[PDB]
Amino acid sequence: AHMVPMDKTLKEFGADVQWDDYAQLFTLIKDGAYVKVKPGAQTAIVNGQPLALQVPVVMKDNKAWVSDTFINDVFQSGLDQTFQVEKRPHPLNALTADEIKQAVEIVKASADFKPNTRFTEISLLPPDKEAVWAFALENKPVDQPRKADVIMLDGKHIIEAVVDLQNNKLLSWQPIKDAHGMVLLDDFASVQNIINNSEEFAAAVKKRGITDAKKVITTPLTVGYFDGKDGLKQDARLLKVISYLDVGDGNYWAHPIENLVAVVDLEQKKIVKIEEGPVVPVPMTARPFDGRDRVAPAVKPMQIIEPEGKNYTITGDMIHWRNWDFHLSMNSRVGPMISTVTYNDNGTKRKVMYEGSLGGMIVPYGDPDIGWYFKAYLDSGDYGMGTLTSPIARGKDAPSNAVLLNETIADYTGVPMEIPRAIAVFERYAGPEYKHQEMGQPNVSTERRELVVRWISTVGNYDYIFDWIFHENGTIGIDAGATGIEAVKGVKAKTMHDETAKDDTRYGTLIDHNIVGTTHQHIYNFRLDLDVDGENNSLVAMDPVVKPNTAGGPRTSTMQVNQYNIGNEQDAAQKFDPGTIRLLSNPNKENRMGNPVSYQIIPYAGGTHPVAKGAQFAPDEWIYHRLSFMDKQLWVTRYHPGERFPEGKYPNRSTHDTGLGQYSKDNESLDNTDAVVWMTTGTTHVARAEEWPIMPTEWVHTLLKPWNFFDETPTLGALKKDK
Template sequence: MVATPLTVGYFEGEDGLEHDSRLLKVVSYLDVGDGNYWAHPIENLVAVVDLEDNSILKIEDEGVVPIPMTPRPYDGRNQSEIADVKPLVTLEPEGRNVSMMDNMIHWQNWDFHLKMDARVGPVISTLTYDDQGEKRKVMYEGSLGGMIVPYGDPDVGWYFKAYLDSGEYGMGNLTSPLELGTDVPINAMLLPATLADNNGDPFTIPNAIAVFERYAGPEFKHNEMLGSNPGNESRQRRELVIRWVSTIGNYDYMFDWIFMANGNIQLTVGASGIEAVKAVRSRTIHDETAEEDTRYGTLIDHNIVGTTHQHIYNFRLDLDVDGEQNSLMEVNPVVAENTEGGPRKSVMVTRERVVPTELESVQKFDPSTIRLMINPNEENRMGYPVGYQVIPFAGGTHPIAKGALFSEDDWLFRRANFMDKQIWVTQYNPDERFPEGKYPNRAETDTGLKAFVEDDQSIENVDTVLWMTTGATHVARAEEWPIMPTEYVHSMLKPWNFFDQTPTLNLPDPEPLEN
């Protein structure tokens, strides 16, 4: 048997537990020798452990559900044929384009400092872009702020499952070492990280962060058929990737900071690993028990339900767009009546607004709108304020999490409000580090972003911090069992009138290659 210790949340005593007690809940799995004990849950049985006196406070037992016993290895050991896949190799015959000195990284026009944090993982700081010889500030410091994985099942072994992975477990300390050729391409530089354990003692994680360059399609292309200079003009896009993976129990989370030569910054999170599953009596969806068994999830195997849940990530981005004084601007494309004549009945226009205060900044993100962090004191050559667009949802492979799938009176919603809105902007405060608050475990109320914005400070032309929330709602499917192919959610920061022209016009035209 394998026992897994889990945090218990807060329910104001409605769960029969005292608030001030230091507790864990333990759920168990049967190890049948297939390498995947997660596929054999012991359902409806939870031990509540008191960490102060190392005792079992109570056992919660809601009745026997047969343990799914069919072996479900996820390492391919039961596959009769292995796919015939030829090697795919990325080579850099003339050396790397990325250089590193101590913790400073330089690639094309980008320079930044990289470090590892025990709670939130990689931290990117003092990020600048060399614009024709001028090093322009983009971001003072950026990292994962926090994340939460809430489940929607009210049963005894599930209702408390809402993991604040970084705030409760420490994702940096749970870093998964990376392997060349599978986790990252073979041209990657692998960097160790030294952190402090729970006793304050240093320990080193080998291959904790990967740094690599990759081909990413055409940077631009045009095939001119007319004029005095016909022919094709295209340039190759490269990306610099900073990759880190943290494994929290059954899930493995891959975080990529992706830098592009054109000034774009993409934040990608991939989720893989093994779904947290529930043992049920139903073998197929046609069984009499299936309707009740699948009320909170999907039957993904005989006697196994993948419970519906969310993966919600918040990034703390202390942007300094050409300096510390920034503002949040909204640009809304709208339809207006055509009053200028001609046959058109309507026209497209944009309406702009600078958001004055913290509370007004808090919003769900509509992909059809434009949200910018601008510097009102700096202009490009056309006179527009320089800025960066904020895109919490820039594509993904699971349904996006438009907000928290909980009612507003639910205890979890009261404790972690950051999961419900995608854009928050606060005036800089060095003590405001984590969207879920500094000490979220068993917190009664939201001591994070909801508390940060209560004083409703001005965010016009001041030192601000952008908090960008993204994520996915995970409705399980059979193709994700017994192991989930990596599912991605993408966010982006994109220069918006930050430059005077296409910033990659100076890319070299490579020699054409032959097959």
């Protein structure tokens, strides 16, 4: 049997391939492996180490060829140290394909299962956090058997079963009264068909100028709750259906059929209601965003390279990097989970964060017309953002020196799915860690490195990017970015000089002919179980104030700080003024100067869109009443195993706040106890032409800073002078 063409197989396999004709040297890059190899050479170089090749690379008539074994021999070499194998499995490891298939098999074996039964979530049910910490810090095995939460959708009915996988037995099976299921993948499909089979809807569509109809693209949206004012029965399973025309530019979003909404009952599998408003001609101009009508730029290359491999290690799901240690896993709803986060301080791992992850997000609009009044995406709770993860485009969505992880989750039928390139891990240069150039002395400066964990999820039209950023000095950043395609309203005006302009643009900017970028908000929320050098913490406020000078001298005022504790959940739920300081401290543990070891919580560290002061809804709005998390930037709640979502566990047609509103309502004491920090950061998005047909990536930042957690500059390095 013959050999295999080098360049060909390598691309298949996903490695970058560079040929240097002058040096006669290939350079092959893939994740932590940086490989050098010359034609006909004895050995290749992997991360700076020699690897024997029995079969040297071959150059024929300018075509290169390698062994059938080359990719494995080189890349799965072990000279790339990036990945190591976990000895004792971590108790928070996500369910395996096997474990998943098992949980599904356990439920299918109970009396009540039925074949239309879909799966909305199949996730590990973590052991109690204490056993989990003892594992991470003390290597104590966890005694409790691996269980899994299985949330089923039986038609429209939700049921929560719990399975024991160690013992292969079913533990719980309770129906959840009045709860609606999230949107599932087949739902998209049913809605396109039901609409395609609608005799009415084709006629509805025909009159709005269409022709064909095979060309109508639908998109499913949840209906929220309007105490019946929308005319929709509280206990049917429904979705409203917004439609666009497909014009062949690959961007149906650019051609709304405006003032046409259809309500579909998924159980019935038919259209129960059609709201029709004024006919507005469908905007027809081609607006591709993929570059089909564009000139490719020539750009000179830029390569971020790490030729001796990475400074992090990935053992199972454990990531070790400089002084950080943490566990990375995936959840179908909220995406990545970052757990058991410790910072190694001169030998001892100190607790920073037991579990951190997106909590939930919402993007709600502020137009009142039929196509828009109920329109509000709960991307994670309602559509499942983990499930909808978008594989990273190597080199573009993440820098060329990224390592990209694959992650496994159950699909909605309980069959395992591996998502390729689900999370990017990458170290990056982030300016000077610090510098001082004393006048007439040698300069002092060192470089800053952040380790970024990056995840992207696309829900319908928008794409959202999350970066969890680990500074070497102890600071942790969380940024959310938004890009993709705007939800636009069809309108009669071509320019602002047209007669309809003022009325068309009342609720958003006219971003293209006949196209308005309806104003709305982007609201993310992070649930951060920060255990600051321990479980029991308190929330401290420091408000800088200008106080009168009462100490003589020429000054009239001084800069002082009003420090006070925040002792309950109700006061902990607040607006964040970035001029103040909010600290989660450990009142049991002080640094060398006798200050309580803490972390400074900053829900607003800036962003590139204007910032929402709060929810852009009157207090009487139903969406306002069910989603408290929207109106406050900072919350802190007592820890409880079940409380995990800012929007509540079943937010679809919820009638009341079951999220942060619910968790803080019992107003528990936040003094010297296990806290959980929630940060809400929102923007108000008034659109502009620069953002159409594709919105350039826009960012918000949040930050978590060590505050007297340490004794000194954390990046000074190992001490020599004494101990």
